[PDB]
Amino acid sequence: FSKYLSTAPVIGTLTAFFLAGLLIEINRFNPDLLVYP
Amino acid sequence: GWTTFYWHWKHLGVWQGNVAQFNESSTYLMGWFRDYLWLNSSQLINGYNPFGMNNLSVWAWMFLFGHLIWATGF
Amino acid sequence: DVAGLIPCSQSDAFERRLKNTTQRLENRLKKYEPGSAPAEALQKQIDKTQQRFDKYRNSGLLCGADGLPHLITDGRWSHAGEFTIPGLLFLYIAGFIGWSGRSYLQAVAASDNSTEKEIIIDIPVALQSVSKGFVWPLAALQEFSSGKLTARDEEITISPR
Amino acid sequence: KIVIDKDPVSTSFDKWAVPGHFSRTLAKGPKTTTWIWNLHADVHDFDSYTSDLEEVSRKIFSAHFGHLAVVFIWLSGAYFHGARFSNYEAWLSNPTTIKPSAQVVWPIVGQEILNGDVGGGFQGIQITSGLFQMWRASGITTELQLYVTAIGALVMAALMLFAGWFHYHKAAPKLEWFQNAESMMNHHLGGLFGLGSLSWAGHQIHVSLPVNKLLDSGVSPQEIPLPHEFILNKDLIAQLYPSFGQGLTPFFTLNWNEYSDFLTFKGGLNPVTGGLWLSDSAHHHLAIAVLFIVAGHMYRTNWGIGHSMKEMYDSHKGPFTGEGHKGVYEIFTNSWHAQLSLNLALFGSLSIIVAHHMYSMPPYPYLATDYATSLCLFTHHVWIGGFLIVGAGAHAAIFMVRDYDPAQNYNNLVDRVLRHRDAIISHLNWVCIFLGFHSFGLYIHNDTMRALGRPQDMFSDAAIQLQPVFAQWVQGVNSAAAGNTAPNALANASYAFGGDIVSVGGKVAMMPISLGTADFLVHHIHAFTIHVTVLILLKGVLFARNSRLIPDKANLGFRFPCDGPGRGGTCQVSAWDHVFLGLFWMYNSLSVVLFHFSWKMQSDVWGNVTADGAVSHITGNNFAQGAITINGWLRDFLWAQASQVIQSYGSALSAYGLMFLGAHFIWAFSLMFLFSGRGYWQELIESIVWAHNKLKFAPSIQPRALSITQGRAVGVAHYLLGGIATTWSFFHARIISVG
Amino acid sequence: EQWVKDPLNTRPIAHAISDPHFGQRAIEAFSQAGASSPVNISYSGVYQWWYTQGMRTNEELYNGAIFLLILSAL
Amino acid sequence: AHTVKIYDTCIGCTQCVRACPTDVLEMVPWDGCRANQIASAPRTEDCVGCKRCESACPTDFLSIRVYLGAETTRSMGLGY
Amino acid sequence: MVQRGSKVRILRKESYWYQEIGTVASIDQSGIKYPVIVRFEKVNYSNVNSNNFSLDEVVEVE
Amino acid sequence: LADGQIFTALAVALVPGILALRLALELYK
Amino acid sequence: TLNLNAPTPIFGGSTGGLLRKAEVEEFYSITWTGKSETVFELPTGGAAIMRAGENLLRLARKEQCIALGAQLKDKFKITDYKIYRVYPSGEVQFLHPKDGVFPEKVNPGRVAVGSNKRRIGQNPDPAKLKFKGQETFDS
Ligand code: CLA
Ligand code: CLA
Ligand code: CLA
Structure with a gap:
């Protein structure tokens, strides 16, 4: 079953998921990261 | 187009002495759309209408003329 | 004091945004119930504009006659946090995306059938390939000096003339 | 007879x-990057x-079940979000002021201003899909009922997806079962369509009918009894329209006139709600029940x-048709x-008829005067309706290349259409050009006489009139039918033909849409652009096999980019390029229909x-003397009504x-x-693949360009997405503001 | 000649308008800049170029027009 | 008419000849081995320039090449 | 002299595979010109992998 | 301007009348 | 030899075929013998019927008499077809098969017209034939 997870589009969205998932919690955590403090 | 759009819009504010309009609206594209294209077409588009016409009817006809012949190329 | 902007802790320009942010939302909050669920979405909202402005008053931002913090990239160390320190944060992650596929497509093309291995993203190779991509500011320096980063111009396919 | 293979796969x-295990050439591996686009x-x-x-x-019979599932998932998504994230229970208390809101936004980086002050005690995006008026029509009062539908849909969503597994991977039917079209029409009319409206009459x-008659009096959403209580209690229901005390006994002695109270022919608008009388739609779906059964x-x-x-x-054949429909049954089974x-x-x-029959006969309570929604179900179903006709033109051409057989079809109607296909197209070519001159050229005449200041020379109402006398005689005879030819109707079929206006709240539900010189002028533009969209699509179907130019276009396939620059050039000779070409014309055909509709109503x-x-109307009766020229169409419709977006x-x-700019972006990208x-x-x-070979990391899948058809297909797919979503954003942020 | 006397407020005239298709209101709108015939307001800036060069009167222009006819004639 | 040239890299596969929609090409005996065959264009006056031929040559770079030239009624494929 | 099973480079400058590595397949050991049948790792535009080259057109990177 | 000079410059433009034709039909040849 | 008139297949139709060019210049014809009574798509519309025949049909162009044969031989296994191009208003009878054998097959006696004895990058440059009437791609 896990060989289906290795294919191109499922890994082109689940790594697109957590990477977009990282930007979104850190903005909810730390709003307006405009300048390096 | 981008060059003349910039030169034209900037000079409009500069000549009427209100550079603040360009300075703040040109940093986002909606300013180039709402405060430049839509705003400045008030007179041009009213060259003729159901109540009469004026000395801009030629330019108004030409403006539409250009749009029609722009699209014909497509 | 580099392009004609006040450090806007003293400005009447940056402060004439705060009132008509908080007066727009209080006039959106007046007709609510004080114990409603949208009301905390309009009390915390002004607080979200309040943490933002009191992050900007302290950081030494140069706000113009509008009240907008403008950026100055000639990069001096007095304004280095605006572009330069998010620049070095960019490039170090960018080579991690740079070298990972670079170390992957060296490691699958040196196998039997790499044409399949672009479809299938091989965790036996991809976790092996980011392990080469973590030393990417050190690996490429000893890859160019050892010459095995580029190739000579009769290896690379040349369109005719 | 029902014959089955048990678990073939x-x-x-x-x-x-x-990927590509279904096929032959793609179950071997990619060598270029087009193999992804060759696959997908x-x-x-x-x-x-x-x-x-x-x-x-058997694949198609299975895949429809999966498509039946994904609507049910999407339906539950409407029904689930209707309970938790909606102001629905508050909206039933007050249908006039509070806007229907769902899809609440999360409180994050700045999209929390999209949860605006919509009403009730609520913050969300004001929606315009009309589920609120479809649930108020359905009888929904509590928000629990919206929850149990969603799981009730989700179990049907799961049941449909299992049934697609059960009928291909488990029990595959055979072709002699599939080809039984006569028994299939018997059931689909009988079971699906007969018992469709009967069961909805049963609802x-x-x-x-009880809980919507009460809300016209409007006692309370809470003080209306639950829907199962009108079957248990015999006295509670027979308080209103008291025929249930007579029970089914007038229905079983054929004395049906005793149900003249709930199963009626009122025929107007319900003046408190502006919608169709649900008594009539009960009698409608009952008459639809017996007619379809x-x-x-x-x-x-x-x-x-x-x-x-x-x-x-057979034996539907005449002297001008030869064999008639001989073998045409043998097409639609094979x-x-x-x-398709x-x-x-x-x-x-059908859906364009739905868009027409829903704004002029509003079926739902408080959908008519809510101009946010009565517009958006016209223009959606029109937009769906044009895309399916282009799909109707596509698979008609695909039938011609791959499925049509001149061995069976000798001298019958597909033979005699193909044997006169120039007379069709060239007369269609003429009536396209004739219509463009005498509809669009009547605007360019009207543009110039206003530009030259000669309003006595333009085509207007106070000018050379082009009166639509056929559409005013039809609008006359349909508005004078309640009492002459439809006596048992109280008022007419609609108030769009004639009669008095109707108001709900302070806004107009319906009034007679009048047709003058400016309405004649636009209705022929519709007739023009439909005939061109026919002409592109009809020529693609007819010349799909051959022409004078290429005699073996049937051999080159349905979707081949060109035959090269030979014969002067043969770029876009294929039937797929005709469907590609008709897509913009359908974009042009429909977007002026919406521009006619959304401006005429305001x-x-x-x-x-x-x-x-x-x-006092919204844009102020400007469609008479303003809509006859392009500058009036540009100023007083496009420039003026985009002031709010x-x-x-x-x-x-x-x-x-953002989307009104965001769709301007994608349209440019196309x-x-x-x-x-x-x-x-x-x-x-x-x-560039030189440069990726230059640093010793080159992909083994070598990159290539997109195919020409895929270059064509992505050029139209971003064109429509850039063009419709502009109109989607324009129509929203106009009518939410001024309505 | 009218322009030289007051470069500020006089609208430069390009040339006369003789378009048979014009209507009654088409004459009055294009009879602008104080003219009694319909004309087009010039916008090429040729007036400001010719002024600096030294032409001042209507016959100095005609002397310019004839000169290019001769220069083209050779 | 169009010019159709056949280069000496032909491998006598016959693919080109069987691709021409107007029968402009034919295979002819080759003398460099007296066993293989090369394509020829004896009827270039009928070449429409469709380029179906060049799409059939298997060799990495064409053995048969179509250079569009003077257009005529025959080459334009006019039934009229 | 080039034998079968060798890696080459390409001096045919009118080709797609020009100055790329090819692993040859066969030599026609009779007098027919351009006899070096060179298979490649990469495929061309019109989807072929091998081609006849001359013995004067192939090299001996080995 | 004048009235005779208007007719005069019309006669000046006749000098590019026949000469522009003679430039053309010889550049044709 | 054409044998005009050979009996045409029983058709009755087709707005799309053999118009006014055929009565001013150069129409075409194809001859074959039908070994059944089977039906086939014409290049005009689709049907005729193959006779016993002697089956002739005045088509429009060369391309339609060639594409008919590549449709005949595959579907109906008949490789006897004998195309023409007409008398007075046309040019050459018997345009295919020109050798009597099919010219996709190889045959002794043919001429190698239009052969360049080189490679295509081995053609001369158009910078080298400036104001010279020699064609660049020609030997
Ligand atoms: C015979 C045509 C017909 C018409 C005009 C209606 C009309 C209506 N339906 Mg009903 N319905 C019908 C049959 C019909 N129904 C059938 C066959 C089913 C089972 C599939 C249903 C199941 C159903 C449900 C579950 C609901 C409705 C509702 C409604 C009302 C909402 C508006 C609408 O649906 O658009 C009007 C639609 C059309 C104009 C297109 C008709 C489509 C059918 C298939 C046409 C059949 C062809 C017919 C013989 C010839 C007419 C051709 C053309 C003129 C339409 C409206 C009174 C809703 C309601 O209760 O509102 C209060 C609702 O919730 N209907
Ligand atoms: C009624 C349902 C229906 C069904 C079952 C089919 C079925 C088919 N169509 Mg048909 N067709 C239909 C309606 C339908 N069509 C409609 C409505 C149109 C008008 C657009 C067409 C026009 C059409 C053309 C022109 C062609 C087909 C073709 C096909 C065949 C293969 C298609 C495929 O595999 O795509 C797989 C799915 C994709 C490639 C999806 C890619 C994305 C598409 C192009 C756009 C999606 C836009 C998206 C919804 C907008 C949101 C954007 C966001 C996601 C970013 C298949 C038989 C093809 C064929 O060759 O038949 C022999 C073909 O060339 N159809
Ligand atoms: C706005 C730009 C534009 C215009 C004017 C046209 C015009 C036309 N298209 Mg085209 N089309 C367009 C964009 C446009 N298209 C685009 C963008 C696409 C890509 C999708 C196409 C794709 C397309 C296809 C696929 C087809 C057309 C066809 C047509 C013709 C339709 C019949 C007709 O109305 O004739 C009458 C002409 C007009 C209405 C043009 C305006 C003429 C004015 C009003 C009168 C002229 C005034 C004056 C006498 C002019 C001369 C003055 C001078 C001598 C002094 C028409 C010439 C169809 C066709 O050819 O059918 C026969 C057809 O099948 N077009």
Whole structure:
């Protein structure tokens, strides 16, 4: 079953998921990261 | 187009002495759309209408003329 | 004091945004119930504009006659946090995306059938390939000096003339 | 007879690792990057690889169940979000002021101004899909009922998806079961369509009619009894329209006039709600029930009687038609593509009728005066309706290349259409050009006489009049039918033909849409652009096999980019390029229909009525003397009514203004693909794959350009997405503000 | 000649308008800049170029027009 | 008419000849080995320039090449 | 002299595979010109992998 | 301007009348 | 030899075929013998019927008499077809098969017209034939 997870589009969205998932919690955590403090 | 759009819009504010309009609206594209294209077409588009016409009817006809012949190329 | 902007802790320009942010939302909050669920979405909202402005008053931002913090990239160390320190944060992650596929497509093309291995993203190779991509500011320096980063111009396919 | 193969293919995750396992050339591996685009096109193109007419059908029978599932998932998504994230329970208390809101936004980086002050005690995006008026019509009062539907849909969503597994991977039917069209029409008219409206009559009388008659009096949403209480309590229901004390006994002695109280022919608008009287729609769906059930005992089955369609088409042949419909039954049992084209045409054309019959006869309470929604179900179903007709033109052409057989079809009607196909097209070519001159050229005449200041020379009402006398006689005879030819109707079929205006709240539900010189002028533009969209699509179907230019276009396939620059050039000779070409014309055909509709209602029909009795409309009756020229169409419609979409910044409409720019972006991006070609963009890869070979990391899948058709297909797919979503954003942020 | 006397407020005239298709209101709107015939307001800036160069009167222009006819004639 | 040239890299596969929609090409005996065959264009006056031929040559760079030239009624494929 | 099973480079400058590595397949050991049948790792535009080259057109990177 | 000079410059433009034709039909040849 | 008139297949139709060019210049014809009574798509519309025949049909152009044969031989296994191009208003009878054998097959006696004894990058440059009437791609 896990060989289906290795294919191109499922890994082109689940790594697109957590990477977009990282930007979104850190903005909810730390709003307006405009300048390096 | 981008060059003349910039030169034209900037000079409009500069000549009427209100550079603040360009300075703040040109940093986002909606300013180039709402405060430049839509705003400045008030007179041009009213060259003729159901109540009469004026000395801009030629330019108004030409403006539409250009749009029609722009699209014909497509 | 580099392009004609006040450090806007003293400005009447940056402060004439705060009132008509908080007066727009209080006039959106007046007709609510004080114990409603949208009301905390309009009390915390002004607080979200309040943490933002009191992050900007302290950081030494140069706000113009509008009240907008403008950026100055000639990069001096007095304004280095605006572009330069998010620049070095960019490039170090960018080579991690740079070298990972670079170390992957060296490691699958040196196998039997790499044409399949672009479809299938091989965790036996991809976790092996980011392990080469973590030393990417050190690996490429000893890859160019050892010459095995580029190739000579009769290896690379040349369109005719 | 029902004959089955039991489990022809089992449950394996092993074929999921091989993409292109369905096919032959793609179950070997990619060598270029177009193999991804070679794959992802012909996935659901089922007769491209499969040769077995029975096995190609079993895939389609399974995949429809999955498509039945995804609507049910999407339906539950409407029904779930209708309970938790909606102001629905508050909206039933007050339907006039509070806007229907769902899809609440999360409180994050700045989209929390999209949860604006909509009403009730609520913050969300004001929606315009009309589920609130579809649940108020359905009888929904509590928010629990919206929850149990969603799980009640989700179990049907799961039951449909299991049934697609059960009928291909477990129990695959055979082709002799599939080809039984006569028994299929018997059931689909009988079971699906007969018992469709009967069961909805079974809903609407016992459930919708009590609790919607009470809300016209409007006692309370809480103080209306639950829908199961009108079957248990015999006294509670017979308080209103008291025929339930007589029970089913007038229905069983054929004394049906005792139900003149809930099963009626009122026929107007319910003046408190502006919608159709739900008493009538109960009698409608009851008459639709008996009409469709007796429609379903018509075709032949294994009980001897019935009409058999192979017998009916034969002996429907005349002297101007030769063999007539000989073999045309043999087409529609032997070709899915011939079925899909005819199924698509009358499915899209059906939905444009839905868009027309819903703004002039508003079916729902408080949908008519809510101008946010009564517009958006016109223009959506029109937009769906044009895309299906283009799909009807596509699969009609696919039938011609791959499925049409001149061996069976000698001297019959597909033969005699193909044997006069120039006389069709060249007379269609003439009536296209004749219509463009005498409709659009009447605007260019009207543009100039206003530009030259000669309003005595333009075509207007105070000028050379072009009066629509046929559409005013039809509008007359339909408005004078309640009492002469439809006596038992109280008022007319609609208030759009004639009669008094109706108001709900302070806004007009319906008023007679009048047709003058400016309405004649636009209705021929519709007639023009429809005939061109026919002409592109009809020529694609007819010349799909051959022409004078290429005699073997049938050999080159349905979707081949060109035959090269020979014969002066043969770029876009294929039938697919005709469907590609007709897509913009359908974009042009429909977007002016919406521009006709959304402007005619705001200036003439919709608006605010005084408590004195007259109506001041929204854009102020400008459609008479302004809509006859392009400059009036540009100023007083496009420039003027977009003043609220670009001033949307800082408000809860500010997501619409981004999309109104965001769709202007994608539409520009599509021009890059239509105006360019392949052999430029291929040779820019050659310099760039040089550079990726230069640093010793080159992909083993070598990159290539997109195929020319895929360059064409992405050029139209971003054109429509850039063009419709502009109109989607314009129509939203106009009518949410001024309505 | 009218322009030289007051470069500020006089609208430069390009040339006369003789378009048979014009209507009654088409004459009055294009009879602008104080003219009694319909004309087009010039916008090429040729007036400001010719002024600096030294032409001042209507016959100095005609002397310029004839000169290019001769220069083209050779 | 169009010019159709046949280069000496032909491998006598016959693919080109069987691709021409107007029968402009034919295979002819080759003398460099007296066993293989090369394509020839004896009827270039009928070449429409469709380029179906060049799409059939298997060799990495064409053995048969179509250079569009003077257009005529025959080459334009006019039934009229 | 080039034998079968060798890696080459390409001096045919009118080709797609020009100055790329090819692993040859066979030599026609009779007098027919351009006899070096060179298979490649990469495929061309019109989807072929091998081609006849001359013995004067192939090299001996080995 | 004048009235005779208007007719005069019309006669000056006749000098590019026949000469521009003579430039053309010889550049044709 | 054409044998005009050979009996045409029983057709009755087709707005799309053999118009006014055929009565001013150069129409075409194809001859074959039908070994059944089977039906076939014409290049005009689709049907005729193959006779016993002697089966002749005045088509429009060369391309339609060639594409008919590549449709005849595959479907109906008949490789006897003998195309023409007409007398007075046309040019050459018997345009295919020109050798009597099919010219996709190889045959002794043919001429190698239009052969360049080089490679295509081995053609001369158009910078080298400036104001010279020698064609660049020609030997
Ligand atoms: C009634 C339902 C229906 C069904 C079952 C089919 C079925 C088929 N169509 Mg038909 N057709 C239909 C309606 C239908 N069509 C409609 C409504 C149109 C008008 C657009 C067409 C026009 C059409 C053309 C022009 C062609 C087909 C073709 C096909 C065949 C293969 C298609 C495929 O595998 O695509 C797989 C799916 C994709 C490639 C999806 C890619 C994305 C598409 C192009 C746009 C999606 C836009 C998206 C919804 C907008 C949101 C954007 C956001 C996601 C970013 C298959 C038989 C093809 C064929 O060759 O038949 C022999 C073909 O060329 N159809
Ligand atoms: C015979 C045509 C017909 C018409 C005009 C209506 C009309 C209505 N339906 Mg009903 N319904 C019908 C049959 C019909 N129904 C059938 C066959 C079913 C089972 C599938 C249903 C199941 C159903 C449900 C579950 C609901 C409705 C509702 C409604 C009302 C909402 C508006 C609408 O649906 O658009 C009008 C639609 C059309 C104009 C297109 C008609 C489509 C059918 C298939 C046409 C059949 C062809 C017919 C013989 C010839 C007419 C051709 C053309 C003129 C339409 C409206 C009174 C809703 C309601 O209760 O509102 C209060 C609702 O919730 N209907
Ligand atoms: C706005 C730009 C534009 C215009 C004017 C046209 C015009 C036309 N298209 Mg085209 N089309 C367009 C964009 C446009 N298209 C685009 C963008 C596409 C890409 C999708 C196409 C794709 C397309 C296809 C696929 C087809 C057309 C066809 C047509 C013709 C339709 C019949 C007709 O109305 O004739 C009458 C002409 C007009 C209405 C043009 C305006 C003429 C004015 C009003 C009168 C002229 C005034 C004056 C006498 C002019 C001369 C003055 C001078 C001598 C002094 C028409 C010439 C169809 C066709 O050819 O059918 C026969 C057809 O099948 N077009």
